[PDB]
Structures are given as C-alpha cells and as structure tokens.
C-alpha cells in the first residue's frame, strides 16, 4: 500500500472524525422574494485575466525543465512567446480592465472690468 494512498485516506479520516464528533456529541435544535442587483464586471476580469495568464505560465513550465536541450534556439521561441503574451498584459494594464483609476480648482469663468460707458 503506497504511502500516498494511506496519506489520502488518513487525511479524509481526520475530516470525518471532526464531523462525527460535532454531529454526535454537540447539541442540535430546530433553530432554522429576494432582491436582485447588477454585479461588478471586475470579478469577471479578475477570473479572465487569471485564467489566461495561468495558461501561459503553464506553457512555460516545460521550458524550465528542458532548458539544457533547448539551449539558445528553444530560448528564442520562449522569448518570442513571452513577448507576445506580455503585449496582451500591456493591453490589460493600459486599458485598466481592473479599474486602476476607479477612485478619484480651475475656474471656467474669468471676468474683466471695462469701466463706465
């Protein structure tokens, strides 16, 4: 029996014991329309930029474990790949899809005296 399989079982067992104690010995009593509103687009952006950037980091992990054979030629393609995805992040930063500037006495009137008619 692999040490990794027994580890998974034991951690699961600990979780059941904690549930079991509080289900068996803790007290229990019967102590137990909705409006709606628009949601913030920033939440979609955080998940979107995370996912797309999470994929690009994943695609670089093979390079870090293959740097010796890749040498100069594989490094060029990795740098080309990094440069392309960096431009999309510049677009992310430049347009502030995360609302970087979300939170933020020149007078339009100047008067001149000319005197008596």
CA-atom Rg of the chain in angstroms:
30
Q: Which of 27, 30, 94, 115 binds other proteins (CB under 8 A)?
A: 94
Site string for ligand CDL, 31-70 (x = CB under 6 A): ----------------------------------------
Query: Which of the residues 90 through 109 are near ligand CDL (CB under 6 A)?
Result: 90
Distance CA 82, CA 57 (A): 9
Distance CA 7, CA 11 (A): 6
Q: Check: CB of residue 60 under 8 Å from CB of residue 83.
A: no
84 binds ligand CDL (CB under 6 A): yes
Query: Which of the residues 21 through 60 are near other proteins (CB under 8 A)?
Result: 41, 44, 48, 51-52, 55, 58-59
Q: How far is CA 34 from CA 23, 41, 43, in A?
A: 31, 22, 22
Name the residues that contact ligand CDL, by CB under 6 A. 72-73, 75-76, 79-80, 83-84, 86-87, 90
């Amino acid at each position: 029996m692999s040490a990794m399989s027994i580890y998974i079982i034991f951690v699961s067992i600990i979780a059941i014991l904690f549930l079991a104690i509080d289900l068996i010995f803790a007290p229990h009593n019967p102590y137990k329309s909705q409006s709606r509103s628009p949601f913030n687009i920033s939440f979609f952006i955080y998940g979107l930029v995370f996912l797309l950037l999470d994929l690009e980091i994943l695609l670089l992990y093979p390079f870090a474990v293959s740097e010796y054979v890749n040498s100069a030629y594989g490094l060029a393609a990795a740098l080309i790949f990094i440069g392309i995805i960096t431009i999309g992040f510049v677009y992310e930063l430049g347009h502030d899809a995360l609302k970087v500037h979300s939170r933020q006495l020149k007078s339009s009137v100047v008067i001149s005296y000319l005197g008596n008619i």
